[PDB]
Write a protein that binds this ligand. Structure first.
Ligand code: 8DG
Ligand code: NA
Ligand code: NA
Length: 156
């Protein structure tokens, strides 16, 4: 048995495009991703997701919808990363580059999988189909998946 730390991940998914950010430093640097980070004490997971979206992309949204949960394990790290994944289609300002992230829109036939975390190839298609999911991925380093599980669920 392992302990887990809470993280959020937010995808702004519109009918023809999705907003990603190029991570400029830190964990996952060099990969396009949604926006997110560690949940803080006292806030709900959804509110931590809203906060991270604002801090990293400049976008302020009233509500997010939970679409999945993914647990990450790394060889040599005792602590699991419990990532709660949220979407919205509804925004009302422009993204702005932060120290963490350079936002960029991608058309939905140009999802930059080769420059995303390798596990995203498995679960992101479910997100695009508006399905809900639970996943688990064990990584050796940044690139290599040793074990994983992915399941569609009716309730996250
Ligand atoms: N798409 C995708 N996202 C992931 C994976 N693993 C993983 O931690 N994430 C997300 C969850 C968080 O949004 C982010 C990791 O949190 P972070 O290190 O950016 O947290 P933070 O903003 O609190 O960090 P910092 O500013 O203190 O350095 O990456 C993955 O394999 N695929
Ligand atoms: Na952050
Ligand atoms: Na972050």
């Amino acid at each position: 048995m392992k302990a887990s730390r809470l993280y959020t991940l937010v995808l702004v998914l519109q009918p023809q495009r999705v907003l990603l950010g190029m991570k400029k430093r830190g964990f996952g640097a060099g990969r396009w991703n949604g926006f997110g980070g560690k949940v803080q004490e006292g806030e709900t997971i959804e509110d931590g997701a809203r906060r991270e979206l604002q801090e990293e992309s400049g976008l302020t949204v009233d509500a997010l919808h939970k679409v999945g949960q993914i647990v990450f394990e790394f060889v040599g790290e005792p602590e699991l990363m419990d990532v709660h994944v949220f979407c919205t289609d509804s925004i009302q300002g422009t993204p702005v580059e932060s120290d963490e992230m350079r936002p960029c829109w991608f058309q939905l036939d140009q999802i930059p999988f080769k420059d995303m975390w390798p596990d995203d190839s498995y679960w992101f298609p479910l997100l695009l189909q508006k399905k809900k999911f639970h996943g688990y991925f064990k990584f050796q380093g940044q690139d290599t998946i040793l074990d994983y599980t992915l399941r569609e669920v009716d309730t996250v």
